[PDB]
């Protein structure tokens, strides 16, 4: 059916058959990985609002 958005998540992308994730079954694949310097900075600023940068 048309007008449908499907979100799927996994921790082991290597276990997904390439036919399951193909351009027309999954139109966008994004990697949500570990923290980075900017990510840690933003997390600290959000958890302790008011402190100096």
């Amino acid at each position: 059916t048309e007008a449908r958005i499907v979100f799927m998540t996994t921790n082991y992308i290597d276990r997904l058959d390439p036919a399951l994730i193909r351009p027309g079954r999954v139109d966008l694949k994004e990697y949500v990985g570990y923290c980075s310097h900017w990510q840690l900075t933003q997390m600290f600023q959000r958890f302790y609002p008011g402190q100096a940068p």
């Binding site: 390439p18 036919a19 193909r22 351009p23 027309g24």
Partner: protein, 53 residues
């Protein structure tokens, strides 16, 4: 077909790597021929040989 005794049936097979346009072409062909599509799932649980016939 009738004048030669051949059964009046035909079957087609589309094969290839995934995402190259088999299902889309079948839908387009059904639209062009003004036919309908009867989706049959062979690997069902209620499907038997007599029921398939």
């Amino acid at each position: 077909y009738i004048d030669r005794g051949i059964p009046y049936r035909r079957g087609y097979l589309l094969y290839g790597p995934p995402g190259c346009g088999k299902s889309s072409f079948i839908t387009a062909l059904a639209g062009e021929l003004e036919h309908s599509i009867c989706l049959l799932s062979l690997t069902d649980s209620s499907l038997s040989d007599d029921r398939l016939n």
